[PDB]
């Protein structure tokens, strides 16, 4: 062996931290191959490999490695390690759609954190439980009681998280709680409360110079103001989102903000502006081969052109809408 288990694992850690989980996995898998009798080290390798696979969207392997970690953490009596493995299992189960199992795992992380008087772990588990319940609520077709109950549970967990990270003075974590809390209120139809939460999210984003969080807050504020009937205000927030979005490598962000602006201007009965924004979304949806998006663009454009009496363009987009609609039949 030219490198030891520990040496290989350390390189994997660094590669993953650097954003190259693919390369990191190779080093962790090399480390597991070499092996070690140090069970704490082995559990750390499994945990890191589980997270790397999670980030590479191999959720089955993520689950396998987080389970291997859980097994070892229990056998050596590493309570913190068991809590972490359980939280990781929960978050993996969440993405797989196994929400009720995710709840148990994430609650286990919470329970052990409390047993250990680990408030940082406790807070993180509360955030995770809010996230599981939020996604659970959406899985039931977001007004059905199963949706309302899960989303309300999400509010409760996010509020408990926010209290604890306020006690811990973790301002960036407060910002994250506010964002997810706001979007949960939004789904529940509590639009004023969504505005209150996203306003805090935005203030916190600005305190940190966090341009991504700022952009998210603008987008979510726009969304909430649409449902409050405040279309002009929504347009102002969506324009602020778009100013940032148009600079991003991920073109979907600009596309969505343009679609939203298109709809806002339709609601304001400014059909010329609506068309401008909808044409931008159409171009990007085509670039990204998003046929559902392209179809929705053609519908929105046809509606707007019709309102202006531009039947030549409206009918161009009717044809394309019909074509795409059959394709996505």
């Amino acid at each position: 062996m030219e490198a030891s288990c520990l040496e290989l694992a350390l390189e994997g850690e660094r590669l993953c931290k650097s954003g190259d989980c693919r390369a990191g996995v190779s080093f962790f898998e090399a480390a597991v191959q070499v092996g070690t009798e140090d069970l704490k080290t082995l559990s750390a390798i499994y945990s890191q490999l589980g997270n790397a696979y999670f980030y590479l969207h191999d959720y089955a392997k993520a689950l396998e490695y987080h389970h291997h970690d859980l097994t070892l953490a229990r056998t050596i009596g590493d309570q913190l390690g068991e809590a972490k493995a359980s939280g990781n299992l929960g978050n993996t189960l969440k993405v797989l759609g196994n929400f009720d199992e995710a709840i148990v795992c994430c609650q286990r992380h919470l329970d052990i954190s409390r047993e250990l008087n680990d408030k940082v772990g406790e807070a993180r588990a509360l955030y995770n439980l809010g996230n599981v319940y939020h996604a659970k609520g959406k899985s039931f077709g977001c007004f059905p009681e199963e949706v309302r109950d899960a989303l309300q549970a999400a509010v409760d967990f996010y509020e408990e998280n926010l209290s604890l990270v306020t006690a811990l003075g973790d301002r960036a974590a407060q910002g994250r709680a506010f964002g997810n809390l706001g979007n949960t209120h939004y789904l529940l139809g509590n639009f004023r409360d969504a505005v209150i939460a996203h306003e805090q999210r935005l203030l916190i984003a600005k305190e940190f110079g966090d341009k991504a969080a700022e952009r998210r807050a603008y987008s979510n504020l726009g969304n909430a103001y649409i449902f409050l009937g405040e279309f002009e205000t929504a347009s102002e927030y969506y324009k602020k989102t778009l100013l940032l979005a148009r600079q991003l490598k991920d073109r979907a962000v600009e596309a969505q903000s343009c679609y939203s602006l298109g709809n806002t201007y339709t609601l304001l009965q400014d059909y010329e502006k609506a068309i401008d924004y909808h044409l931008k979304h159409l171009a990007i949806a085509q670039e990204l081969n998003d046929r559902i998006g392209e179809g929705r663009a053609c519908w929105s454009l046809g509606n707007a052109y019709t309102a202006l009496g531009n039947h030549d363009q409206a009918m161009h987009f009717a044809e394309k809408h019909l074509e795409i609609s059959r394709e996505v039949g």
Partner: peptide, 26 residues
């Protein structure tokens, strides 16, 4: 008249992390 999109911007998610650099922990 309108087809509203289902997009909203959720916050970053976490995982719990371990490191072999915790070798000397009790």
């Amino acid at each position: 008249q309108l087809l509203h999109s289902d997009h909203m911007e959720m916050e970053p998610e976490t995982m719990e992390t371990k490191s072999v650099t915790d070798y000397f922990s009790k």
